[model samples]
Target chain A: AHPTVQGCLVSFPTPHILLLTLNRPEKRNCISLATSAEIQRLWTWFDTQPALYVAIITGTGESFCAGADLKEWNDNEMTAPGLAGLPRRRGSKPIIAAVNGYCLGGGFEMVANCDIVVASENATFGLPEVQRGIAAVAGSLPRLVRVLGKQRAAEIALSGLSFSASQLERWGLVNRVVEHDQLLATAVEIATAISRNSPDSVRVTMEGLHYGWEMASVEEASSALVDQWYAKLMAGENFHEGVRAFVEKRKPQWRPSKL
Target chain B: AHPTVQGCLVSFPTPHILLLTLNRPEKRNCISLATSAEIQRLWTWFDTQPALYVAIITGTGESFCAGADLKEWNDNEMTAPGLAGLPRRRGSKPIIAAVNGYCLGGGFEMVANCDIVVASENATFGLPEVQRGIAAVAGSLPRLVRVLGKQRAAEIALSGLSFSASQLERWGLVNRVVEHDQLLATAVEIATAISRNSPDSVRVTMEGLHYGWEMASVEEASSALVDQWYAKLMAGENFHEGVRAFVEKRKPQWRPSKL
Candidate 1:
């Protein structure tokens, strides 16, 4: 099916792996309301469709949606929306960012939402919101603090330093880095592996993780989130598919359901 | 043997883990009366008691407790009692660091109040209080930071950088770093190995950590601290110890009450 939003496409290049891309390269693919809305919609769609297990989001040009479009927001007298930063409620669909270049400002937050990120050597990352006379309010400070801790994150925030792809990998932010040209293929390979798994299993696993992480109490996380997912899986098609696939030593056809 | 005001020497190890250092090189391990009194009556005794668990402390040079002398403080009238710096009181019993070296001014305050630490080669750890315009108000920032947040502890009134062998290990701070020799051995053969055996259980068994990290919402942590602790043992013998040990054996011998 043709993508709904102008610059964003949600497609199943393979049976299970959904590929989402920022299609506007003319303005270096700067994020606009259309982009954010498209993403929100795409994720919502992917969540409901069990055919799509994992998603790989990248951009058409050198960079991944070179952050929010200031021109569009300023002209419209609006601000870019901040995803639930502290609460972490974006429902883990297990996105992998295939970041290429000039990853900065709001661009960083896109990757922050993803479970994993794979960047190219040409990529550069930073939160230059302070230089714009604004705090890195769009989930930069809170997100960076959680991962990099106080000292390192403080250095980047207070000094507004741009980190090279090399430095980011050193700090254990990005999982792996590849040559600039190998970006998309690497993301696809990782997505493919997940795609091969039973969709029911993957969806339940993702939901379990998302619920467990956000649940306040440990008991609730364990019994309510994990146990519920277990019960659902035990009753679902995936359990039989998993066992059959194991015995037959073959790829079991997964029965798709609501993501 | 009975304990004394000098310190308690408990035969059993607890979760507390205190490391002591006796700072005195020029005076051959001599500590001031106040310093000795503080350790003897306060830290050492507190660490080894029933409420606490483990402690490791060492000192400078060829001597550990090189006695205490008041003349050095008198010589520098600016030093003496004012030099000892402000003492600290944390939880009833969790950790302590007792350091020893050419322990200048308030050097004794650094290690004599820590959980554990391993020293360095030629490490003349001390607090040169009089050298600076002010006194060693708060001891080493390390100990304070371990309890307090990094930014909060960095605000410690005084600083203690230099340190020496065995002292650092006992304090549980620098469990063991490289020395002129045998440092790696001490760390690998002792510290790292010790860490391997039920580290999570040991950490969770401590009352302070249970109240602190385990109970709190572990925001951004990969897994909730408390749940993760349970998870570590979920597939391990720790689970069996509570179940199988009840029938196969008597009460579980290794497991102890939270300190």
Candidate 2:
């Protein structure tokens, strides 16, 4: 069952997946100061809760999210410290964005922060701050270059044109695209697949991938991976269990510990 | 006649573009340590030559590259110091990959380093190091996540499966795809287009794009862009020439230096 918390619908559809939906359909799920704080709290809960290994964030109605509550935007405009407190830093779990309709400005930035994105055929994505004579300073400007290549990223940001889900899928921003009717199911399927993997391994792998982006050279990245492998992967119980299960020809029961 | 440097075939098809082909087609152009050094030297030459603004790398016969030469795998593995010596850090120019067939492992890592990629319909890409009981640490492990997102990148690395050109194009790893016969033509056309643009602007823009990937926040990238604008674009003669060309409806001659 879904429970409403401020403008968000927080639900645990399965033991491993936490589904968070933006519920302010009246405003097309636009994030106001209060909504942003609520989002921050929900994410913190997602991070601390050990039972949940993944989060699938979407929207309750036609829109995924319309970005900042523009009507309420002011000189004192507020954003949850670090755009919901998770967009700018690394965390243990992965976030998958399931976009149903409009995803623009801050909404688009949140999508960029997610580990994977599943979009409905009808979804539209953009950073329209340029059209508004402002910049997408939350995370869009810097992160877009990493997500999409330079030329395409610059084209999207400078033009400020809303793009289709297909375009984003082609650009590697969206992991999957489905009919509007199949959006949530597709995302849930992907999340379930990931949840079956060893959580420790998954987290460490994610860490390495993220670190790779910031590294200065291949040598440094290689060195970092060796350290991560020893500290995290080699020392973890799941690694042994995975090997044992392979030998036994059975599914490995993973223990949530470092060993 | 093809001038061979170890396993590479180096040629100058156009004054501004250097074409470096992996000539070991019988061996699928697997890179040996010697070949890696040759590749390194060619990159240095590309950087030092003012007349050559870009380099297009491909395989000679059928396959583009098969990554590290497995027969000589014990000795060496290859990597472009800075992920292309272009992706993470700034070199003065860009590398465009022209892929015809099988690009895997270390070969795929080289493709990741390139600024632009043009692939043939038959091209296939992958990282098979995991299946071979090794890691794709050279550059593929980290850079793939940035180029192709966490989910797809992890799948490719973990599963060690080869993907088609269509798949890579959809993932944004490939900038363009053409018929197998038109691969070189399309790549040269692109290189020519880039060469015609103001060289100084192109170099600085490439620099900014590379820097943007490493930025922590949008504010930092935006701030950096303003500085680059003032220092590289606004203060340079190319900006005025660009505007003048637009207004006069004719190509304004571009000088290769800053104001």
Candidate 3:
């Protein structure tokens, strides 16, 4: 097992969800190089471990991740050859950010990558990238534009306006917003719901949705691209277990694989 | 049945909508072909005919058929067989655009080709095609523009935009966007909403949304396009149920198609 990287934690449990917590309560769990490295590495681990269907990311303190650790960035530029060198990063797993409090700046970038987010009522967010002589070039721009319409995304990025969880939800950005105390539990419930579904169906759904976005037209999309990925899942022995479980009216013992 | 070439005006017993009108007191509701044709071809006759489901195009004044006649452009050599040919042409069914008072010039073109139109508001619409050295070509541009986004349809050969019906609804264009004054007792509700239920399902849904715009993105668009085309079940048993129910005046027995 890799040594425990400070400011980060990971666990794989039943229901097939991977729980990753931001442990640096001292600095509002601001992401560190070590934490970012762990995030980048988790994608590789997840690909090989299909049981890890979903991931929930939260913080220990009042804040989820207060943007970047300015002190850290000022001290060392995050441009090394690879993983640890990358600053303020996350993994490819379907991330669900359980935002407890202030989810601002780089924190917003991390949340943007998440498939779903459950934020505390008190949690506020913003992308102030333009003010610091830089842009939220770290992929937030495209995601925001795609999630919210161009007009709204432009308002956020260009004006650098801060917003509340309710506002984000109104714009259909975050899935749900809960009270501060309930953020973690609510997020875990969502993760469990996703994890409980037939593993093949869940993974394939993501694969299909992601691939479907690239097709020229709807007909051309839903057919050809999904067939290939679906075939791979069906070829596996456990694929039958999914149907058998339903027939038996019992939970299937879905063993994770290298998805 | 009429000859295939002389398409029959098959009317549904339910009378999708009725065209009510107010007579034009002044000028005896005189309108020009250019103006009336749009209301005619695009709305009334077009929508109720074959390809379309229903429509309503009518006018005010004695003017149910009063508008411009751009005969001058028909004799122009530059437009006879060239770039500026007869432009504003409506579709077979679904073009019903209801007109009201003062439908002139191009307005007549609108009236000549509609399906069904109500005209209590009696607003006028027309085209000065002759003034511009061209023929009434309203339908083709607007209709084509909708099917083919902005880039392709902006250049209407000999162009200028004008049309009326302060509350006139055009085919499927203004499904339910008419004002209070425009509607009457129980008003002429043109379209029907189907209840959502599922069986084998029609798998039927609107296309050209995500699959249309995101084809340029990662993969979703491309894959969705393919599935929609190749994998889509067109002449399934469900379609038969839909048609059967319509003919029998009963609810469709088709099952809701699921992904």
Candidate 4:
């Protein structure tokens, strides 16, 4: 059963895939602060849900997600990890952003942290926070720099300009750019690939990937992953089963990650 | 005048760009221990050498770089920052990789940390250290994970499989893939774009980008950059000239960075 999350329509599109659709296309799927908190809780639940292996977040109508609600109060402008707890939250599982239309400001920030991003050719993204005298102080500045490099990242974030899906895909932010109607299908296909892998391997691999992004020392990160997570990965039954299945020339029946 | 380094052809391609060509094509430009130290000194020199704003590393003949000189024995097996002082080398200036042909093992590792990578369509890349019973303990595992994600990195590194420039570009490891003959020209074009910008801006921006890659805490990285490097950036004449040029609607004459 799906939790009742306002502004979102949650459903299991496949056996182990979650589709979190932003329902307020009338408002261009602009996330209200309350809605952001609701999404935060839902994602927290998704991380712990044993049946869920992957998640896809998208929007209905002509918007994947837009900026924050223009009516948001100014008392506490924002917090750690930014909108919808997606920008910087290091979740245990993966989130694929299937962007169909306008994905501006906060929407851009949210996807910066997604494990995979599939966008329609018509999708648009930008960071206009500079124009509004509001710096995008979320996790985006660093993450975008990693993908877009120095000069290009500066032009996009500093100029408050917009970019197309094709540009972003080349820049390494979006994993794939597809037909408008095929964005969901492409995201689901990638999600299925992840699901079909050993669940324990997926979990441990994500752990290693997270270390790559956040760790200061690559050598240190490698050692730490091998010393800790690698050992934990080996202890899981799925790891042994995966090896055995390969030797036996059969598909492995993977279980949900216990770690 | 170019410093005479063995197994290298160093030249000034443009007003403010350095071209470092690996010259020993007979050996697929395999980097020996001494050559690695020599190239390390060269890059160290380039970082501080006045008038050079950007640098490009490439190879001649059939291979961009093959691997380490397998004939050399292990004294210190390796050190921080692998072959040619490229992979994981933190420096003040930007270096682009212009890959024409085979880039495997140490060659592949070297390009991993380049600021921008432009490869020919026929270029091939792989890491075969695992199969050789040689763990590529050099900073590739973590860095590759950042660009290739978990699975692709594992497949490339663990499987010891080779991939095309087109594939790596899509995977985000390589920035651009062009016709074989156009690789150097395209690289020079990108280097020119970087050199024409304010040198101070390029340095400080590279600083910020390095922070993005190496810093654990994104918020802390942002704050640290502003607190330290931003002030250093504003203290330079290039920053002032760039701003004034924009106001006057003219191209800025940027000086070499002081910071």
The most accurate candidate by DockQ is 2
Q: What fraction of native interface contacts does model 1 preserve?
A: 0.00
Q: List the residue pairs that clash in candidate 2.
A: none
List the candidates ranked by TM-score, beginning with the highest.
4, 2, 1, 3
Tell me how far candidate 4 lies from the true structure as C-alpha RMSD in angstroms.
Answer: 8.8
Indicate the docking level reached by candidate 1: incorrect
**In CAPRI terms, where does candidate 3 land?**
incorrect
Instruction: Give the alpha carbon lDDT tens digit for every residue of A70-186 in model 3.
Output: 788778433322322122233323556788877777788777656667788888888887878877765666657655657888998898778988888766467667887778788
lDDT of 2 by residue, B114-144 (tens): 8899999999997755333244666566767
lDDT by residue for model 1 (B3-80), tens: 332332323233433334444455665556555556545444643454333444455464434323535533322221
Q: Which lDDT tens digits does candidate 3 get at residues B1-259? A: 2111111122332333323232333544443334333333334442333323333434433354443332332221111111111223222223344443555443443443333344444454444332222223333323222232211111111112334453223312222334436643212344322122322231223233334433565466556656774355445666678678879998775443433
> Individual DockQ of the candidates?
0.02, 0.16, 0.04, 0.12
Q: In model 4, which runs have C-alpha deviations exceeding 4 angstroms?
A: A1-139, A145-163, A170-259
TM-score for each model: 0.53, 0.62, 0.52, 0.62
Across the candidates, what are chain A's individual TM-scores?
Answer: 0.85, 0.91, 0.85, 0.96
Candidate 2 chain A lowest-lDDT run of ten:
A77-86
Per-model TM-score of chain B: 0.33, 0.88, 0.29, 0.96
Alpha carbon lDDT of each predicted model = 0.51, 0.73, 0.48, 0.80
Find the number of clashing residue pairs for candidate 3: 114
